[PDB]
Amino acid sequence: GLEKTVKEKLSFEGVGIHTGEYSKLIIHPEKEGTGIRFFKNGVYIPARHEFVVHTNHSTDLGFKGQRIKTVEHILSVLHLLEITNVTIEVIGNEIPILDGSGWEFYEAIRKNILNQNREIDYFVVEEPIIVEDEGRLIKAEPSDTLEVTYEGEFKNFLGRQKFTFVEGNEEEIVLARTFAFDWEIEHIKKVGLGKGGSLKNTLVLGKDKVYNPEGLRYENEPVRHKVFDLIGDLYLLGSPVKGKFYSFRGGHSLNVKLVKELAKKQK
Ligand SMILES: CC(C)(N)[C@H](NC(=O)c1ccc(C#CC#C[C@@H]2C[C@H]2CO)cc1)C(=O)NO
Ligand SMILES: COC(=O)[C@@H](N)C(C)(C)NC(=O)OC(C)(C)C
Ligand SMILES: [Zn+2]
């Protein structure tokens, strides 16, 4: 496909899930070859794995003392829409969580795409690879299309679930919200995270119950969301990705480990 930017500036704002602070974004059009980058306090932070500074409960980037938490959801939307050149100006410390999914970003950006004049140089997975960390595993192999499977093993009523995204099915993952388990939330808050979490932006689950009155958007909403997260983390390769991926219990740390290994192999 063609490289793409946005036709005009687009703004989003709201609380961040981990900081609990209110932040604002402005997405700026950029010319071919710019890439995806964030901008904060005069500093450009490329959306690339070299700038990752944190991977526990979110993927965060930093450069020159300027940090932005929770980049994975906006990056996933940009990856899915193949937006390749933009600057995400951040006023604040975190990307807004909005409803917990990619939906608001996706709907606004998709109606505001500007095609550009050269084609995308995709990051094409060249050979099989596997990364592992204590029972968790992610595998990648060559594919002409982006295909991403996540398999979860939940210690509540959900049990085992799996879900596969393929190109053309973006609408199946951009509404899946972030989630949390009631028995884990105290620790998450104790370690300085989750300050903005609520039933308005998070699917909160117990051993045998759902806290949100509206319930789940899909019976497998959590694994759809984990696929969505992985697609955002994969964009830290710096180009839209072609490959077939399978994650068993992976999270941001393992996702970024895979990205760094792929980048090293194909440098
Ligand atoms: C899903 C994944 C991959 N682990 C990660 N999400 C988080 O880590 C995360 C998201 C929300 C909360 C909360 C809250 C809350 C709350 C109020 C108390 C409940 C109302 O009764 C805590 C952790 C993610 O989506 N990364 O992208
Ligand atoms: C059992 O609780 C933990 O160990 C959390 N650190 C853990 C569950 C690994 N978070 C997680 O899923 O990874 C993400 C993707 C970084 C949010
Ligand atoms: Zn997420």
Residue located via tokens 């600057």? 87
Q: How many angstroms is the resolution?
A: 1.2
Pocket test for ligand 2, best of 18, 54, 55, 56 (most atoms within 8 A of CB): 56
Q: Is 48 within 8 Å of 239 (Cβ atoms)?
A: no
121 in a known ligand binding site: no
Q: Where are the alpha helices (DSSP H) in the chain?
A: 72-81, 103-110, 182-190, 221-234, 252-265
Lookup: tokens for 185:
């939330």
- Who contacts 25 (Cβ-Cβ below 8 Å, separation ≥6)? 11, 12, 13, 74, 88, 89, 90, 91, 95, 96
Tell me the domains of the chain and their CATH numbers: 1-121 (3.30.230.20), 122-267 (3.30.1700.10)
- Using DSSP's 3-state secondary structure scheme, residue 46 falls into strand
**Contact 115 CB / ligand 2 (< 6 Å):** no
Residue with tokens 């991977």: 55
Q: Where are the beta strands (DSSP E) in the chain?
A: 2-6, 10-15, 22-29, 36-40, 43-46, 52-54, 60-63, 66-68, 86-91, 113-119, 123-124, 129-133, 136-141, 147-153, 160-166, 179-181, 203-205, 241-242, 244-248
Q: In what order do the strands lie in the sheet with 129-133?
A: 129-133, 136-141, 244-248, 147-153, 160-166
Catalytic residue flag (residue 252): yes
Q: Measuring from atom 4 of ligand 2, which residue has the nearest CA?
A: 56
Distance CA 136, CA 196 (A): 28
CA distance 96 to 192: 17
Which sign does the torsion angle of CA 167, 177, 255, 248 carry?
A: negative
Spatial distance between the Cα atoms of 150 and 63, rounded to a whole number of angstroms: 31
Method: X-ray
CA gap 62, 27 in Å, rounded: 18
Give the integer Cα–Cα distance in Å for 158 and 156. Answer: 5
CA distance 169 to 126: 24
Yes or no: say if 244 and 129 are a contact pair by the CB < 8 Å rule: no
Which atom number of ligand 1 is nearest to the Cα of residue 72?
A: 27
Cβ of 14 closer than 6 Å to ligand 2, yes or no, is: no
Per the listing, tokens 């053309």 go with 168
Pocket test for ligand 1, best of 15, 57, 138, 221 (most atoms within 8 A of CB): 57
Q: CB–CB of 113/3 below 8 Å?
A: no
Phi and psi angles of residue 37, each rounded to the nearest 5 degrees, phi first: -145, 155
